[PDB]
Amino acid sequence: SVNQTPRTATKETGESLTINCVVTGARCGLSRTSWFRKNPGTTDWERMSIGGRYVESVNKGAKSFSLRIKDLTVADSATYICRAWSDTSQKPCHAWEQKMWEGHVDGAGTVLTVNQAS
Amino acid sequence: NLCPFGEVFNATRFASVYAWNRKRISNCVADYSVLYNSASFSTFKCYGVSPTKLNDLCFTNVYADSFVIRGDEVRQIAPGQTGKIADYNYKLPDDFTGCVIAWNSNNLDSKVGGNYNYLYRLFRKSNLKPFERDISTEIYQAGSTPCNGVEGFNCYFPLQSYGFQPTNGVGYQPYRVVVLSFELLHAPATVCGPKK
Numbered sequence: 001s002v003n004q005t006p007r008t009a010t011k012e013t014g015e016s017l018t019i020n021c022v023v024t025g026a027r028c029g030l031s032r033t034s035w036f037r038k039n040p041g042t043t044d045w046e047r048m049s050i051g052g053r054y055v056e057s058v059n060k061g062a063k064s065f066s067l068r069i070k071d072l073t074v075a076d077s078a079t080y081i082c083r084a085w086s087d088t089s090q091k092p093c094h095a096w097e098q099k100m101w102e103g104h105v106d107g108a109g110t111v112l113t114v115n116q117a118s
Numbered sequence: 119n120l121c122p123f124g125e126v127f128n129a130t131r132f133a134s135v136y137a138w139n140r141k142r143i144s145n146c147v148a149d150y151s152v153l154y155n156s157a158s159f160s161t162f163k164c165y166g167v168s169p170t171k172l173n174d175l176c177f178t179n180v181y182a183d184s185f186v187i188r189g190d191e192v193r194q195i196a197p198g199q200t201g202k203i204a205d206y207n208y209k210l211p212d213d214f215t216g217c218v219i220a221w222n223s224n225n226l227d228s229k230v231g232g233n234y235n236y237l238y239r240l241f242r243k244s245n246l247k248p249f250e251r252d253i254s255t256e257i258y259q260a261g262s263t264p265c266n267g268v269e270g271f272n273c274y275f276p277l278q279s280y281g282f283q284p285t286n287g288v289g290y291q292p293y294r295v296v297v298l299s300f301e302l303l304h305a306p307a308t309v310c311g312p313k314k
C-alpha cells in the first residue's frame with residue numbers, strides 16, 4: 001500500500017504543492033515510481049513528466065518518495081496519484097513468510113484546488 | 119491457446135464480495151505482461167511470486183476469484199489481514215501464492231440515487247477459513263436469546279448494501295478485484311507463461 005498525503009489541498013496561484021507517498025509492505029526495494037494526474041470527468045490518467053515544474057525526490061531507504069509542483073496555476077487543479085513499484089530487481093528483499101508484496105500500487109490521491117490570481 | 123483472462127477482467131457483471139465468483143483457468147498459456155504493465159490497475163500485488171518472472175513459470179491450475187468491494191477495503195485482500203471483508207467475506211491464506219489486482223469501477227458500478235446490488239456480510243459466528251464462501255442469510259444471533267428467523271434485539275440480518283453513488287469519496291467508491299491463485303501440485307502443469 002501507499003500512504004499519500006495530503007489527501008486534499010488548496011493553493012494560491014504561484015505557490016507550490018508537495019505530495020509525499022510512503023510505501024508499506026513492499027517485499028523488496030522501490031524499483032520505480034510514476035505520477036499521474038486526472039482531470040474530473042475524463043477517462044484516462046495522464047502520466048506526468050518530471051523535470052520542469054514537476055520535481056521528484058526518492059528516499060530509497062525509507063521506501064518513500066515525493067513530488068513538488070512549482071508555480072501553481074488554476075490549470076493545475078486536478079487529482080494527483082503516485083504509483084510505486086517493488087520487485088526483485090531491487091536487491092534487499094524480505095522473506096516470503098512475511099506476507100509482503102511485489103508489484104505496483106497507487107496512493108489514494110491528492111485533490112488539488114488552485115485559486116485564481118488577484 | 120491463450121488463457122481466457124478477458125472473460126474474467128472484462129466480465130459484464132461482477133459478484134458481490136460475499137458471493138464471490140471463482141473461475142478455474144487450465145490448459146492454456148498466460149501472458150501476464152499485458153496485465154502487469156496496464157495502467158488500468160491501481161493495485162497489482164503478488165505474494166510468493168515475482169510478477170516480473172510470471173511469464174517464465176508454469177502452474178498446475180490457476181484460479182481467478184472476482185468481486186466488488188469499496189476502495190478502503192482493497193487492503194484487506196491480502197494474506198494476514200483482518201476486518202469485515204477478510205474476516206467474513208473473502209479470506210486469503212497466510213501461505214498465499216498469487217496476485218491481487220484491483221481497479222476503480224465508479225463509472226460502471228455506481229448509480230445516481232445509489233446502486234444497491236452489491237452487498238457485504240457484516241456478521242458471522244466465526245471467521246472464514248481461507249477461500250471459504252458463505253452465501254447464507256441466517257439471522258445472526260448476537261446475544262443469548264435465539265432469533266427464530268426474526269430480526270430484532272441482538273438478532274441481525276447479516277448482509278448490508280454498499281449503496282455506491284458516483285459522488286462517493288474514493289474510499290467509498292466501488293473497486294473490482296480479481297485474485298489470481300497460482301496452485302502448485304505434484305502433477306503436470308496446465309498453465310504456463312509464453313516462455314514455457
Ligand SMILES: *[C@@H]1O[C@H](CO[C@@H]2O[C@@H](C)[C@@H](O)[C@@H](O)[C@@H]2O)[C@@H](O[C@@H]2O[C@H](CO)[C@@H](O)[C@H](O)[C@H]2NC(C)=O)[C@H](O)[C@H]1NC(C)=O
Nearest residue numbers: 121122123124125126127128129149152153156157158296
Ligand atoms: C479488456 O478489454 C480491453 C478493451 O476492450 C476493447 O473494447 C471492447 C468494447 C471490445 O471491443 C474489446 O475487443 C476491445 O479490445 C482490452 O484492451 C485492448 O487490448 C487490445 C489488444 O491488442 C488493444 O489493441 C486495445 O487497444 C486495448 N484497448 C484498450 C481500451 O486498452 C483488454 O485486453 C481486455 N482485458 C483482457 C484481460 O482481455
